[PDB]
Design an enzyme around this catalytic site. Structure first.
Site, short mmCIF file in Angstrom:
data_model
loop_
_atom_site.label_atom_id
_atom_site.label_comp_id
_atom_site.label_asym_id
_atom_site.label_seq_id
_atom_site.Cartn_x
_atom_site.Cartn_y
_atom_site.Cartn_z
N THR A 196 40.82 41.05 50.77
CA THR A 196 41.51 41.87 49.74
C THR A 196 42.52 41.04 48.92
OG1 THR A 196 43.11 42.63 51.45
CG2 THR A 196 41.22 44.10 50.98
N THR A 197 42.07 39.91 48.36
CA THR A 197 42.94 39.01 47.59
C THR A 197 43.17 39.40 46.14
OG1 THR A 197 42.25 37.08 48.93
CG2 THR A 197 43.35 36.63 46.84
N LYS A 202 39.50 47.20 43.00
CA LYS A 202 40.81 46.75 43.44
C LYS A 202 41.81 46.58 42.31
CE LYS A 202 40.54 44.32 47.81
NZ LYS A 202 39.52 45.00 48.65
N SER A 210 45.01 39.49 51.99
CA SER A 210 44.64 38.61 53.09
C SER A 210 44.42 37.16 52.68
CB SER A 210 43.37 39.14 53.75
OG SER A 210 42.35 39.36 52.78
N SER A 216 38.08 38.28 51.76
CA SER A 216 37.91 38.42 50.31
C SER A 216 36.56 37.87 49.85
CB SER A 216 39.05 37.72 49.56
OG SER A 216 40.27 38.41 49.72
#
Lengths: 227, 203, 227, 227, 227, 227, 203, 227, 227
Positions: free
Chosen positions: B1-2, B33, B129, B169
């Site tokens: 989840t970058t 996102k 992350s 990610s």
């Protein structure tokens, strides 16, 4: 123009509404009771009605507890209702203290209840009057609770369209400590003298209790005696 | 989840990636996102899916309300402060989230708000992350001067190296750019690939 | 000028509002019931109407429980409503004690409910009158609950524009323990004699129960017999 | 001087307010329905209006559920409102039992709701009347819920300024189990004969359902047939 | 003597209070809107006032959402208030479903709100009337919400002291699918013909939307065109 | 006979109560304000009173915030009260967004508050009228909130027994962007021309703000200048 | 409790299995896991029985309400968003469930919603104890092009291999197909067996 | 016909009820106070009564705190009540901030309290008027709180049947910073000149405070001096 | 037309209702009390009644606590009620502080209670007046609480139809510190002189307390002495 709300005092300082309910009670059939030598008794007039009515459910006298009982006079609806509170209150009292110690706070609970309804709008007081009698840690007991929450302990009193005439009597004939049977008749006389010429005092119910004994309801034949 | 959000002169860029994980498992190789939360504002969710989304909506709705009746966007700071407050008002029953509020009101801003409600403005901020990597690249490649396009490249060079170490990610690399002139404007997929291929990356 | 609020007593001590609802009940079609040898029965007049009306939903008699049932008389709206409370109360009673032990507290629950509405402003009493009947740990049961919460257990009684005339009869003709079929007709006669000259008592519904048996609704042909 | 509050009975024992709302309903355009051979139907008069009004939102007939639907008559405001409760209640019923088992408790929920508003001050009853119809575990269903909460299951009935005249008809012409199309016209005639001389029954909406099938709204051309 | 409380029906079955508010709305300046080929429009009369008043805050037309907007007519106070609820309700709707799917339940929320206030004492209904219009999953939308909660979807309608005269027109001149500019003028004419002799229709505000596009407010010069 | 409750519309559809409070405001001393070149100002008449009264507590002008301030006119009690809500609301607004972004929602909060009290019985609206003015993300601001919750943004307006006469003036003399001192006197003239022959405009308080600057209250000597 | 939902051109397939477990124990070899929640929408429960069912009902009811009064099905996304919100509004007192919302409104959609309320749209999504397998097959057999029937086969080939490793999935293989034309349409048992026998599986 | 409820404005926009209570206050005996050189003082008339009344409980002056005190005028019942709130509020204020910082918010709390009661039906405002005085972080303080919640800070003021005449005086004789003893008599004169011919100003109570010192009540002999 | 609600002030600023209850108290039989050398006493007239009434329950004097006691005058219902609150309040006070420290806050609690009921509609004040007396950390105490919540500490005072005449006396004969027996008779005289010609002051009850001692009720023979 004041006698319209339970919460408005008149210019004299009266609460006509509350009074009017003491008036509803005055429309109920007479009933008295008096303590004597170890115990008290209760007498209630009942103008016999439809033989289609199970006599079990027309007794102005009720056993709140084994050692206490009461009688009402006024709106029949409010009658039943209050009766229950008594029975109910009895219990709570009986369970928080292990036994119905003072018959008084049983009558308090009922008085306090009835009183309330004579101070708030949106409600109307009970058109009933209750006479409690029984045995407690102290002994013979007799109280009379009116619509406004007023309670007083007697040695002899009454409620109903008769009251006045029945108290007028006792108030000049009653002599304490009489042996049950004697007190029974005195009241019978007293009760009698409250009717109107021509009327024949029919069979009135009667019950008693005596230090160390549970109440007992005189059956229609043991009653047919003092006739 | 970058994800990340860098400021510049009269501009703000915000780029994420789009992978939803669950351990050594990958549920979706393509989720959302990066969202536009207002005419001149954007936001990057990162952490717990549910919470995040609910926030976005709770937001998009509120910014819009204001905008619709007040006829003026809401200050980028007031937006972060609002989010701040909402997050702290229940800091004990938090949101497993971590968002970024970037946009331009009078100046290009970028805010990092945590599960506590503490929002702090910075030059750049990488949530996710794989942010330690983005924070690695940036601490050796970002420069206040940079061009509107040099930025769009920098951001990519980061999430692209991040995708090389952060098992969490992956996917495409959604990027957008807020200009006082063009407002929020997300770049086309193709255009992003262009950038990629030139650098020397694959995926 | 008193008959305007449910909570205002008149100078005589009357609650004209509450009375007025005992008046709404008096606008409903007659209906009686009486216990006999092991069980009770119920009879309800019904002036047949539109053949477009599913007879299933026009029976003044209702099965609260298998062993108990009742009949109303007055405002149809309030009718249905109360009926449910009975049915509902029935259950609660049935679940906290494992079985509907005393049919009495079923009638209590209903009486207490109806009573309330005759003591608070902002509300209006139910313009209904209910006659309950069935079998409990004790046996045949018959109670009649009026708008004010007043309940009395009978051996025979009725409600409706007839009541008086129907009780006038029973009150001088009814003789207990009759064998179902016999008690059935007696009531039929009683009921009959409440109508007005010219009127022909159409087909009235009837149901019964007997110690150890569930109720039963006489079907229009088993009824067409006592005609 | 009594017809002012929803909670005051008249000296006859009437609730003039509640009545007055049964009066608001009487200002709404007629509408009937009747069950037949496997299913029921509904017919509603509609005096065509502004062509600027999207016909989708002027149908006195509404699909509560696929297998049930209803029609109203009275205050349009209260109309919509109640309709929803039906739709809504439908669901809850549908979710706690897995399916709208008995169309009855759908009508109960609505009746109970409407009833309430006719017993407390500070509120006013709904000036609407609803006719429900559909298919349940039992089969064809038809109920008519009035302002006071009164519900009755029919085979054929109606609401609106016509009702009386429309029931006067059916009550002497209706014959059950008719094959849809036949029942359709009979009602059409019945409906017709409720208008006033000179008036030409315009295109009225109609919908039906039949054991095992979902409802269906006759389109203005399939309707233009029975004209 | 009935027209005093929001909860009292008249002997005819009317709610004069609720009506009286439909009367407050009739004191507000006219405003109509109609859908056409892919989209709808709205026109509102405004008798230009003090040049000291920032024109931004005197537009009877409001953007609830980008794709939806409305116009009111009546008490200015209640005007603003309701407007917000719309805007607000809009959002909640928009957040629980991800987007304002059906413009309908936006109007429902508002109708249900307004309705309530016409059934409880202690409150008074909104003296406002709202016309909603916009684009949803379905397409062009036009609803008109009155004080009592009544909502109807149109193709063209209006509110205000004009309404009748403006609908009288459209109801005999309006022809769907007109190309924006054409529909714009037709309404302009319709609006015009509602004034009183001598009056000169000043510059009225107008806004529109079209499948796939956000609304847009014609600026006073693009409007000064259809003059 | 309608002008008695805040919740009863008249036959014309008016809310006389709400109006009557717009009347209480009309009993308060005049006060206006107008924006100009970067900022706004406020002027309030004050008929000097007892020298025993600490001038600090008789300023119809109040600093809600450093960048915003307001003035009232009407019941002094309700005056203070509202003022606080403004100040209070200001803060909450200031804390949830980090700064009082739009002076508008400060006025909204106050309008919404005041509005409420004009829709529920048991309450009475505020007999006050507030004029807000200040600087926000947008710039100079001026709103006037009436008893009913009505808010409008101006370039110049007023409240008080004068209002009309003061607006009558500005509405034909005011010219925007004036350099503070010039706008100051124009209003002084406007204000002057609202008094009655013979009266001599005593020393009125005045305060201003200008893009990027906090407010400032002209001291009695800097004011004694425009006399 | 293996289920899946794949998209295509103007179509959506959703296939489950039907076994209810309790450790090394199997209560029912035949329960329900695939339900039609609306005219053009379906849903696959997976995880805790109770919760799951209660949801289906809470759903079927709400979609129907809208549909009945609004005369138009509800967007497949708004349906997932609704479910999303419901699940998060009580994320701390969750639903031991994991559902899939598939259907066609304007386009064929498929949503995976978790106990958090986070709903993400994807190409395909496999919820259930045997989904890692379905995700194994699919990542080497699914193709956007595929025919309406090639799909009904692919789905089966998966839950059929899944049933070969996941001790928790078994029973028949209920499958359905949403076409803008034919709407939700569950396939007949016999027809499913046809597919089976041809491939080469048993049960 | 308006002066009947606390929530109804008159056609002029007046709240006659609230006024009427400012009238109850006017029936209470005069009392003033004024600040001077470092501190303030208070004077209260008291027409000596029954020597059977413990003087401790008839002092219109009360010590809220050591550094603050007040005096009332009106209904004695409401008098005591408010006094407590002051005392009570004092504390809370004192505990959340460590000390009674600004005597102001002590008076606010009281003003806000009193205000409320002049806006809701079902209640009646306090027929009292309070004059607060003391020392805070700022210094000498004097406020006068009326029935409607109105508070103003003075240098000298009064309440009671005198007020007007007492202020008439001070308003043309009072000169600040007087040395306690001098200010004391000035007020004594002022007070004197409010009585009616023939009356002899009996012994009035007086108390003071001075920057850095606690209050002090002049004893009847130190008072008998300025006689 | 004002004397109808407890919350409406008259044009003079009076609360006629509250007064009317001070009128109900004036219908109760006289009763006074006064402190002396170390302690206080109480005297109550009682016109002997029915010998059927247990004297224990007709004593206008009640022992709230061992060291404190009170006497009432007015509506008997409200009498009992208040009495309890005293007793009850006594305790709470006694338990949060370890002992009934100041007899004052016992009277406060009661005053505050009684006060409330004279400010809210829907309620009615107590038609009772209470005189408290006892010993606390301070010493002899005497307070008199009226219907409106007004409390004052005396050295001697009274309530009842006499009060005035009884205070008229004491107010010109009472001399503090008298040795119990002496103070006893003085009051006896004072009390006597309040009756009407012809009346013979029957046996009045009396009780006292003295620094360091519990109360004590003079028995009818120790009382028969001062006759």
């Amino acid at each position: 123009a004041y006698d319209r709300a339970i919460t408005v005092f008149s210019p004299d300082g009266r609460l006509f509404q509350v009074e009017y309910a003491r008036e509803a009670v005055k429309k109920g059939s007479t009933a008295l009771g008096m303590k004597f030598a170890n115990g008290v008794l209760l007498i209630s007039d009942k103008k016999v009605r439809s033989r289609l009515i199970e006599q079990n459910s027309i007794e102005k006298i009720q056993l709140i507890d084994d050692y206490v009982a009461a009688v009402t006079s006024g709106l029949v609806a409010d009658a039943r209702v209050l009766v229950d509170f008594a029975r109910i209150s009895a219990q709570q009292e009986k369970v928080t203290y292990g036994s119905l110690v003072n018959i008084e706070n049983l009558v308090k609970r009922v008085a306090d209840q009835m009183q309330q309804y004579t101070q708030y709008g949106g409600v109307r007081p009970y058109g009933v009057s209750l006479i409690f009698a029984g045995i407690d840690q102290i002994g013979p007991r007799l109280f009379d609770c009116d619509p406004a929450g007023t309670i007083n302990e007697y040695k002899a009193t009454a409620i109903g369209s008769g009251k006045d005439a029945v108290v007028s009597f006792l108030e000049r004939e009653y002599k304490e400590n009489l042996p049950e049977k004697e007190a029974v008749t005195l009241g019978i006389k007293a009760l009698k003298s409250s009717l109107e010429e021509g009327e024949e005092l029919k069979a009135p119910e009667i019950a008693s209790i005596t230090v160390g004994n549970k109440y007992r309801i005189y059956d229609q034949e043991e009653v047919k005696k003092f006739l | 989840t970058t994800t990340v959000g860098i400021t510049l002169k009269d501009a703000v860029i915000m780029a994420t990636e789009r992978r939803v994980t669950m351990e050594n498992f990958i549920m979706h190789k393509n989720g959302k996102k990066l969202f536009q939360i207002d005419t001149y504002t954007g936001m990057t969710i990162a952490g717990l899916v549910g919470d995040a989304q609910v926030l976005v909506r709770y937001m998009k709705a509120e910014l819009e309300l204001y905008r619709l009746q007040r006829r003026v966007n809401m200050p980028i700071e007031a937006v972060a402060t609002l989010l701040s407050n909402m997050l702290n008002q229940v800091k004990y029953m938090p949101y497993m989230v971590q968002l970024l509020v970037g946009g331009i009101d009078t100046a290009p801003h970028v805010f990092s708000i945590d599960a506590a409600g503490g929002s702090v403005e910075d030059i750049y901020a990488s949530t996710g992350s794989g942010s330690p990597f983005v924070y690695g690249v940036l601490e050796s490649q970002y420069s206040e001067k940079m061009t509107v396009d040099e930025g769009v490249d920098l951001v990519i060079r980061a999430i692209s190296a991040a995708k090389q170490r952060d098992s969490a990610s992956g996917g495409m690399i959604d990027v957008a750019v807020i200009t006082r002139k063009d407002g929020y404007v997300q770049l086309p997929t193709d255009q992003i690939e262009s950038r990629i291929r030139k650098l020397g990356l694959i995926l």
